[PDB]
Design a protein around this ligand. Structure first.
Ligand code: BCB
Ligand code: BCB
Ligand code: BCB
Ligand code: BPB
Ligand code: BPB
Ligand code: MQ7
Ligand code: HEC
Ligand code: HEC
Ligand code: HEC
Ligand code: HEC
Ligand code: NS5
Ligand code: LDA
Ligand code: LDA
Ligand code: LDA
Ligand code: FE
Lengths: 332, 273, 323, 258
């Protein structure tokens, strides 16, 4: 039922406003240990010999690396994505230039996506960056992805209940609730807001009085947009293991300036980045995936805030490998 | 000066401390020793509010705000401008409230009546302590307490709630809200009923105890009775804070997640998971 | 201590009284029975109950509304009885999610909600007639009915008057435990934080005052139960020492006092004002104010605070930022 | 353009704000606070001598009289002139305006302070249909003690000093509300009966404990006119007597507890 004291608390607004984090140490420790499994950087290698564009036969992304540099990458990729499966997950034992296994082609696009993240989305990932490990955590299927309908459990490494299974219709409300921090909000924030750029998150008017011409009847946004934004915010908070005051002074959710923390701006960039990733890198990959990876509408698994963050306000508590693997970005 | 029936009640005695020294009235007000301590604390607190408010940005009453210290000062004294005034004012408040309660027991003794009213007045004093003293003790800073300002204290209630994603799902809150609602409803019913019996209108004659009970038996099939509705009303009102205090004390010290998630004890039973 | 104020020490039994009303004396059904444990803290007699036309009409319409809600709820769990009990709190009947304006919504998107709203409203009106006419039948003033009227009026405000004034049924209160709770935040978020709505403030002021008054009034009567202060009607018409002491307790405490009758007017008025203030607030919201916080800023009332972590510009307004 | 805008930086909600305060203060000041004054007004000063004309504020603070049509005949009008006639056996302890009064005699018999009774009608309170409301069980023979509960009839009454003071002979019941309000008891060694409000009674299974008065003080409990019914003023006299004991039964009860 309850969590024993003490609680760790932080301050994120002026004194007296009750803004800041409330954290259970046990829970933080369990997440710290889970995230400390991040494999350490492989030892640096001397840049020696010709570029692998001249040495190997089918190297389209990593072509400016030397042989030892490139094989160091391939070791790191195997550690991050398929340590249990090994190099043969993506490769033919007898022909390392064969694209015959689908993980090869996907991994190539993932290489491009990852460098895109570290080069074009520094407004969100800063100097910390991502690697394949950030999402994959040592398995080819990342533990936290989303379909065009809610699935349970959130961690696909756990085995679903009959009711949790997406085909059991009697369990839909619970599948939806657990994605919105157990609220009864009747909206799926992922397909509404993170799958594409079609919907506006902001719903609150920016004037005191209602403007004539947007304020009556069918000119009005339905109230459901406000439910939906709230649902997105429940989901976002739960995905970072935090509460609203991490980003907002609830005195005025819609105001910036002194009424928002810098984390709110970073979160804003995060919404745009996730949209780019899903629309332009992850959703097109239903062409290249087996039918057992796709959802009930032939969609590929896509990313939300939890995919990288897994319940922590900084993924892997700020761990970085950017300086150790320049080939993953940023790219000049 | 005096109500037509008042003089025969204006007798000596019933004090708790000081005997005759403070046993007197000033206008309608009984004084007593706790009358004196109350005025002391009120004068001190209002002075500190005034001094603190003048060192602040504005004089608009809606925007004045005396705030507690940053969390980093823990449970220690903080510099006057950045939390100290809040600390001082808080102590005056407790002095004033407790004095006020004890003054009411003295008035009760002199009139030979029950002490039920100061007893009931303990509940809101207790709730004030839950918010400003006990819960900040459990968390380790006075910084978690609420600020003194007409509108600013609402911003604290606001953010405090959203620190647990949706406070409405707090079970102590649900209980508290339910007593606030039914208490307001019962008071309407009780006042409505009494007035309806004494004031039928039209020169019609005033009705009876039996009419009172007949009405509620007719409408809802039961009538708790005259004395009992007064006991129930004290019970209902008191439980706004008596049950609410659990939902407040729990948040932070004994629960750090959102309050919707707390209901997983029900939703996630494996039997029907 | 006066143990009588805690519970009845020695209970009494006697023949059941029946006050005759101008009509309907035969529509009292049931045989009265007595509960000894109830009788410790209250009156021991349960029943009979009056059973007029308006009361049955209320039960009829109410059950229809309940049934429409429960059926839609069960549809939400594809009629699995076990998941229905599990998920009960999270199930709901929703007004339209899409913007149809004031057009009648499809049954699958708000029509059933509108239906359940109609039958609940009829049930409330029917019960109101019961509350009113029962008073006149027994020769009593109609004070309760006018308080109850304000409470019904507030429900109509959040249920359909405010939707029709702004012109969208999408703004009604859903039916269900958690979902009617969720509406409060959606609404407050839409209209710019309800803490900054002065009529929220008024309503809360009166609601808190109802707690203050009923705690204070209840405590007062119990403190004078030894002199019979619970027999309030005859203390109104013939002031006894009970209400003299009650009046003098408050006068010597706060400097002024009520009478045994006027304290009930206070209480009645405070109760009424919870609902009247709430209704003015909803009636103004959306029709004449769009963001209550900005409205308080416009009129110079909102508090401001220093930044703690750095002030943060809206990134969407920086040059070259994506949409 | 804006819904709710008016000329020169006014909007409708701003006006309603003012109107709402005006409504509140009107009802509170001009209505409720005058209703509050239908008892005990006009106030009493160190002799209000101006018999020729009333002072203006005393007229302004009062509501128009209202008349109650009583259920068994009669009318009451409030407010009205009701000075307290009876001589009070109290003396001013000082010259100050709000100094307390002191009892000159025995305050329980003299009915001052917490022992004061109101001057209610010397009238028996009545049921809906005219009968006496508060009657002992010997008269109210269709009323019983509920099965479960002490029958006090026969039990002794122990006073504050631990002395048995009498024996409970009957319970008086409210026939309108089905609720016992008094015990009747014979005071031992005095050949008379006394009534006790239940609220002063600690009902145990072998005794009735009564802490408000001493055993000897049961002798001077106000007596009733009739044996089998009570008037509203008598109810006040009886109830007040024990309440006066809370402060007066012993010299130490009026002084500070600390
Ligand atoms: C977004 C945040 C929200 C929120 C956050 C919230 C928090 C954080 C807490 C509450 C609490 C409470 N909320 Mg809740 N809330 C409530 C109702 C309530 C109260 C019933 C309950 C107790 C308030 C209290 O402690 O007073 C305190 C009053 C006191 C202490 C009175 C002190 C008086 C003192 C003794 C004397 C003062 C004397 C003066 C200075 C003298 C001057 C007098 C002059 C005239 C001379 C309703 C009815 C709603 C609705 C309709 O939505 C709601 C929504 C919300 N609440 C939002 C969801 N609420 C409290 C609770 O119980 O939670 C379980 C609480 O801690
Ligand atoms: C846990 C949640 C709490 C809460 C949540 C809350 C909400 C959500 C709202 C209020 C509102 C109010 N609160 Mg607040 N509050 C207040 C006082 C106030 C008033 C400004 C106002 C109406 C109160 C009322 O009518 O009650 C009933 C009592 C009555 C009717 C008797 C009259 C009391 C009098 C009007 C109070 C005036 C006090 C003075 C302004 C302050 C003293 C000044 C000094 C210098 C003498 C005090 C004095 C305290 C203390 C000592 O604990 C307190 C604690 C809390 N409030 C907790 C922090 N309160 C409302 C408001 O409009 O604020 C702007 C409002 O919407
Ligand atoms: C984050 C969102 C919040 C919010 C959102 C909110 C909204 C949107 C509205 C309120 C409203 C109100 N809020 Mg507020 N709120 C309140 C307190 C209050 C109430 C005093 C007031 C009136 C509601 C009421 O009494 O309904 C209880 C009584 C009701 C609902 C009447 C029911 C009567 C009906 C006849 C009953 C009959 C039912 C049938 C028998 C059953 C049949 C059903 C079947 C057929 C299905 C407190 C004390 C706090 C604190 C401490 O923070 C708070 C914070 C919040 N509120 C946050 C700001 N609140 C209302 C208001 O005043 O706005 C100006 C309002 O409209
Ligand atoms: C500030 C003003 C307050 C206020 C005022 C007032 N509120 C009143 C009156 C006043 C003056 C009445 O005169 C009337 C009444 O009659 O009271 C005895 C009434 C009402 N307020 C109810 C509920 C409510 N008030 C709420 C709030 C506020 N109100 C605000 C706070 C809330 C909240 C907070 O959500 C709720 C849920 C119902 C009990 C009742 C209507 C039943 C009905 O409309 O029928 C609807 C028809 C049905 C079939 C529903 C059946 C179930 C219900 C519980 C009815 C069952 C009764 C039945 C007799 C049981 C038989 C038992 C028998 C076998 C032994
Ligand atoms: C469930 C229990 C209910 C309940 C019960 C009862 N309530 C009682 C009694 C009972 C039984 C009394 O016997 C007593 C009384 O006599 O009635 C007239 C009383 C009283 N209830 C008051 C206020 C009240 N009740 C509230 C709530 C409930 N009550 C709940 C609902 C609320 C809110 C917010 O809800 C308020 C504001 C005063 C009017 C009065 C105390 C006067 C005092 O104490 O004098 C002493 C103090 C002063 C005169 C001023 C002191 C100034 C200090 C030093 C400096 C200010 C500091 C302050 C903290 C700053 C705050 C700023 C602010 C904007 C944040
Ligand atoms: C200057 C100096 C040295 C003075 C010394 C003396 C001294 C201690 C003075 C104190 C000065 C102070 C601090 C005064 C402030 C007084 C205060 C706190 C007033 C608060 C008033 C408020 C806002 C009350 C809210 C409650 C309210 C609306 C009450 C209105 C209705 C009333 C009067 C209710 C009380 C009341 C109740 C509850 C009954 O049940 C009852 C039953 C039968 C008869 C009368 C009553 C009755 O009067
Ligand atoms: C999927 C996540 C892979 C795992 C595990 C391993 N490799 Fe890989 N490899 C992968 C891709 C998508 C590519 C193409 C790279 C590009 O820039 O286009 C490669 C390439 C190679 C090569 C060069 C082969 C050639 O074209 O001649 C070699 C030699 C190679 N990979 C070796 C290698 C080893 C030894 C691995 C286990 C340590 C390994 N790879 C894992 C995808 C994936
Ligand atoms: C989150 C932003 C990711 C990062 C960074 C990387 N990957 Fe990824 N990958 C991600 C998703 C959401 C998916 C879809 C689920 C799926 O299993 O397809 C994938 C998929 C792959 C695959 C295909 C594996 C399979 O389907 O069995 C491979 C081989 C893969 N990803 C490799 C890979 C590499 C090498 C990465 C770093 C260069 C990398 N991914 C980053 C999410 C994310
Ligand atoms: C940071 C990681 C956040 C947390 C935790 C919460 N919110 Fe949020 N919110 C955030 C951003 C970046 C934005 C802007 C979205 C955009 O695309 O522009 C928002 C927006 C809102 C809004 C809408 C405000 C408007 O202009 O209409 C609301 C009402 C809101 N947020 C509320 C809210 C609540 C209640 C939260 C805790 C449950 C919460 N947010 C968390 C960033 C972050
Ligand atoms: C991997 C591709 C990510 C996805 C998807 C999302 N985030 Fe992220 N975030 C990521 C990194 C590598 C970092 C850097 C950590 C650091 O040390 O700077 C971040 C940072 C944030 C922050 C800043 C938190 C802070 O304490 O300063 C926030 C508020 C944040 N992220 C929010 C957020 C949201 C709301 C997302 C979904 C829209 C989201 N992130 C996705 C990596 C990735
Ligand atoms: C002209 C026509 C077509 C349109 C106008 C129709 C019209 C007047 C519509 C009005 C609609 C209104 C007033 C809607 C208001 C709805 C509101 C305020 C709903 C609020 C809360 C609902 C709740 C809490 C319902 C929960 C439902 C359940 C728990 C299932 C029902 C079962 C029950 C046992 C009910 C118990 C409720 C409670 C006593 C515990
Ligand atoms: C809007 C509510 C309409 C409900 C109609 C059904 C109620 C019937 C009223 C009968 C009243 C008869 N009467 C006056 C003798 O009590
Ligand atoms: C609980 C919300 C209370 C907010 C009170 C704000 C009221 C502002 C009214 C302003 C009156 C108009 N004017 C001219 C003085 O600005
Ligand atoms: C926010 C709700 C406002 C409620 C206001 C009720 C206050 C009661 C004022 C009592 C005034 C006393 N007196 C003697 C000056 O009239
Ligand atoms: Fe009463």
């Amino acid at each position: 039922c309850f969590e024993p004291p003490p609680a760790t608390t932080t301050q994120t607004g002026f004194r007296g406003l009750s803004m800041g984090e409330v954290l259970h140490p046990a829970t933080v420790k369990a997440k710290k240990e889970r995230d400390a499994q991040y494999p350490p950087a492989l030892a640096a290698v001397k840049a020696e010999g010709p570029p692998v564009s001249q040495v190997y036969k089918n190297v389209k992304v990593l072509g400016n690396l030397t042989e030892a540099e490139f094989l160091r990458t391939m070791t790191a990729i195997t550690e991050w994505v398929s340590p249990q499966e090994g190099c043969t997950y993506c490769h033919d034992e007898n022909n390392l230039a064969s694209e015959a296994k689908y993980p090869y082609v996907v991994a190539r696009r993932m290489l491009e996506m990852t460098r895109a993240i570290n080069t074009n989305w520094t407004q969100h990932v800063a100097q910390t960056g991502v690697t394949c490990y950030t999402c994959h955590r040592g398995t080819p299927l990342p533990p936290y992805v989303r379909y065009l309908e809610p699935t349970l459990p959130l961690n696909n490494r756990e085995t679903p209940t009959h009711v949790e299974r997406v085909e059991t219709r009697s369990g839909y409300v619970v599948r939806l609730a657990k994605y919105t921090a157990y609220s009864a909000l009747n909206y799926d924030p992922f397909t509404m807001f993170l799958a594409n750029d079609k919907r506006q998150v902001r719903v609150v008017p920016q004037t005191a009085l209602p403007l004539v011409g947007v304020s009556r009847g069918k000119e009005r946004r339905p109230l459901s947009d406000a439910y939906a934004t709230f649902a997105l915010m429940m989901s976002i908070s739960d995905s970072l293991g935090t509460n609203c005051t991490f980003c907002h002074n609830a005195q005025t959710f819609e105001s910036w300036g002194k009424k928002s923390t810098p984390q709110r701006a970073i979160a804003w960039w995060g919404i745009r980045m996730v949209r780019d990733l899903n629309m332009n890198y992850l959703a097109p990959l239903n062409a290249s995936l087996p039918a057992s990876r796709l959802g009930r509408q032939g969609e590929a698994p896509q990313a939300d805030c939890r995919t990288c963050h897994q319940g922590v306000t900084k993924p892997l508590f700020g761990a970085s490998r950017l300086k150790d693997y320049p080939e993953l970005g940023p790219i000049k | 000066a005096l109500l037509s029936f008042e003089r025969k009640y204006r007798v000596r005695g019933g004090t708790l401390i000081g005997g005759d020294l403070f046993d007197f009235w000033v206008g309608p007000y009984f004084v007593g020793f706790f009358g004196v301590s109350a005025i002391f604390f009120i004068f001190l607190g209002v002075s500190l509010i005034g001094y603190a408010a003048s060192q602040g940005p504005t004089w608009d009453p809606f925007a004045i705000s005396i705030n507690p210290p940053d969390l980093k000062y823990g449970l220690g004294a903080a510099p006057l401008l950045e939390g100290g005034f809040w600390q001082a004012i808080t102590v005056c408040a407790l002095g004033a409230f407790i004095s006020w309660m004890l003054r009411e027991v003295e008035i009760s003794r002199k009139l030979g009546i029950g002490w039920h009213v100061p007893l009931a007045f303990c509940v809101p004093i207790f709730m004030f302590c839950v918010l400003q003293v006990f819960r900040p003790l459990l968390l380790g800073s006075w910084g978690h307490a609420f600020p003194y300002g007409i509108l600013s204290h609402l911003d604290w209630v606001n953010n405090f709630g959203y620190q647990y994603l949706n406070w409405h799902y707090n079970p102590g809150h649900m209980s508290s809200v339910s007593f606030l609602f039914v208490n307001a409803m019962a008071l309407g019913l009780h006042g409505g009923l009494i007035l309806s019996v004494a004031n039928p209108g039209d020169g019609d004659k005033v009705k009876t105890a039996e009419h009172e009970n007949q009405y509620f038996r007719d409408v809802v099939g039961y009538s708790i009775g005259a004395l009992s509705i007064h006991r129930l009303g004290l019970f209902l009102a008191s439980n706004i804070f008596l049950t609410g205090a659990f939902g407040t004390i729990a948040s932070g010290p004994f629960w750090t997640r959102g309050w919707p998630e707390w209901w997983g004890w029900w939703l996630d039973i494996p039997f029907w998971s | 201590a006066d143990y009588q104020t805690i519970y009845t020490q020695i209970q009494a039994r006697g023949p059941h009284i029946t006050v005759s009303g101008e009509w309907g004396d035969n529509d009292r059904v049931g045989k009265p029975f007595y509960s000894y444990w109830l009788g410790k803290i209250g009156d021991a007699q349960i029943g009979p109950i009056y059973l007029g036309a308006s009361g049955i009409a209320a039960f009829a319409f109410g059950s229809t509304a309940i049934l429409i809600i429960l059926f839609n709820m069960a549809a939400e769990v594809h009629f699995d009885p076990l998941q229905f009990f599990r998920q009960f709190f999270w199930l709901g009947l929703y007004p339209p999610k899409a913007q149809y304006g004031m057009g009648i919504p499809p049954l699958h998107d708000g029509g059933w909600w509108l239906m359940a709203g109609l039958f609940m409203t009829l049930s409330l009106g029917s019960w109101w007639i019961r509350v009113y006419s029962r008073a006149r039948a027994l020769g009593l003033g109609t004070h309760i009915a006018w308080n109850f009227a304000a409470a019904i009026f507030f429900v109509l405000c959040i249920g359909c008057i405010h939707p029709t004034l702004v012109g969208s049924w999408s703004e009604g209160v859903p039916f269900g435990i958690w979902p009617h709770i969720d509406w409060l935040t959606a609404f407050s978020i839409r209209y710019g934080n309800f803490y900054y709505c002065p009529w929220h403030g008024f309503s809360i002021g009166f609601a808190y005052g109802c707690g203050l008054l009923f705690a204070a009034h209840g405590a007062t009567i119990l403190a004078v139960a030894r002199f019979g202060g619970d027999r309030e009607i005859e203390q109104i018409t013939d002031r006894g020492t009970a209400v003299e002491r009650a009046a003098l307790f408050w006068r010597w405490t706060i400097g002024f006092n009520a009478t045994i009758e006027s304290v009930h007017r206070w209480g009645w008025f405070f109760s009424l004002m919870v609902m009247v203030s709430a209704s003015v607030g909803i009636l103004l919201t959306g029709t004449f104010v769009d963001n209550w916080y900005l409205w308080c800023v416009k009129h110079g009332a909102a508090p401001d605070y220093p930044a703690y972590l750095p002030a943060t510009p809206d990134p969407a307004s920086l040059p070259g930022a994506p949409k | 353009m804006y819904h709710g805008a008016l000329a020169q930086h006014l909007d409708i909600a701003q006006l309603v704000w003012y109107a709402q305060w005006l409504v509140i203060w009107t009802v509170v000041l001009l209505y409720l606070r005058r209703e509050d004054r239908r008892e005990g007004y006009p106030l009493v000063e160190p002799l209000g001598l101006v018999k020729l004309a009333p002072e203006d504020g005393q007229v302004y603070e009062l509501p128009y009289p209202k008349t109650f049509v009583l259920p068994h005949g009669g009318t009451v009008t409030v407010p009205r002139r009701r000075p307290e006639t009876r001589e009070l056996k109290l003396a001013q302890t000082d010259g100050f305006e709000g100094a307390p009064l002191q009892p000159t005699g025995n305050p329980l018999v003299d009915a001052v302070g917490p022992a004061s009774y109101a001057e209610r009608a010397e009238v028996v309170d009545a049921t809906v249909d005219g009968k006496a409301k508060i009657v002992p069980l010997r008269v109210a023979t269709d009323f019983s003690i509920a099965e479960g509960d002490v029958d006090p009839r026969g039990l002794p009454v122990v006073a504050a000093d631990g002395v048995e003071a009498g024996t409970v002979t009957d319970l008086w019941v409210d026939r309108s509300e089905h609720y016992f309000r008094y015990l009747e008891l014979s005071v031992a060694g005095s050949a008379r009966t006394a009534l006790i409000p239940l609220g002063f009674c600690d009902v145990k299974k072998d005794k009735i404990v009564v802490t408000s008065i001493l055993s000897e003080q049961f002798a001077n409990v106000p007596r009733l006119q009739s044996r089998d019914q009570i008037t509203l003023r008598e109810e006040d006299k009886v109830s007040a007597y024990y309440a006066g004991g809370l402060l007066y039964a012993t010299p130490e009860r009026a002084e500070s507890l600390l």
